[PDB]
């Protein structure tokens, strides 16, 4: 067998964290249009049979709190886990509405030893966020 077992009772969870409005003190501009991505993602993963949960404008705290809580759920009957992060960011970092959250921190909640209900199952992270400021001028 070389393909993941996706025949469990349910496809799994699809957490979409859509941060559009940030705290003035962060100096982050609103991410206009991200609502479109959120709706789209929601519709698409809905049709892929995932249980979708949209969370909007979460603070860095709420983001961790959320991932902690999601990782502590029982995914025994689920096939996979999908987490979509829509926000500002930099290499290894995504912004909560009030500050940054390093990716590693919210990803460790789902690693083998921490989330045993997902062990051996595909953990997918889709991230729409800058990884820095370099620009690609293309060629040809």
């Amino acid at each position: 067998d070389n393909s993941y077992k996706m025949d469990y009772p349910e496809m799994g969870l699809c957490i979409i964290i859509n941060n559009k409005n940030f705290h003035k003190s962060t100096g982050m501009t609103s991410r206009s249009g991200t609502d479109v991505d959120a709706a789209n993602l929601r519709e698409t993963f809905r049709n892929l049979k995932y249980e979708v949960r949209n969370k909007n404008d979460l603070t860095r705290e709420e983001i961790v709190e959320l991932m902690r809580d999601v990782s502590k759920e029982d995914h025994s009957k689920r096939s996979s886990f999908v987490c979509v992060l829509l926000s500002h960011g930099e290499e290894g970092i995504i912004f909560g509405t009030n500050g940054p959250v390093d990716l590693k921190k919210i990803t460790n909640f789902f690693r083998g030893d921490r989330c045993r209900s997902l062990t051996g199952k595909p953990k997918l992270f889709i991230i729409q966020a800058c990884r820095g400021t370099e620009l690609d001028c293309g060629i040809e």
């Binding site: 067998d1 993941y4 996706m6 206009s32 991505d37 595909p122 800058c130 370099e134 620009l135």
Partner: protein, 91 residues
């Protein structure tokens, strides 16, 4: 016994250290391309191959426009980071 870092897949909207484009009304280049490729290929292709489609699309069909020379005519390539252990199919 397997690695704790195993079975992870990070699908970045852009390459390391790079900027990531978003259209005020169409959404982010990466997301609208992703959703589009899932709709046409979820029932026909392995996930890696779908993301590759996403890459070619974002790389091919998008190019920034700005009155600001610095941000004008820019391109973007998504980045697939797989630590997956098997082929993934949504069916």
């Amino acid at each position: 016994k397997i690695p704790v870092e195993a079975d992870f897949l990070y699908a970045y909207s852009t390459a390391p250290g790079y900027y990531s484009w978003r259209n005020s009304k169409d959404g982010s280049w990466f997301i609208q391309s992703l959703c589009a490729m899932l709709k046409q290929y979820a029932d026909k292709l392995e996930f890696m191959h779908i993301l590759t489609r996403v890459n070619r699309k974002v790389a091919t069909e998008f190019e920034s426009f700005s009155f600001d020379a610095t941000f004008h005519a820019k391109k973007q390539i998504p980045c697939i980071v797989s630590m997956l252990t098997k082929e993934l199919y949504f069916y």
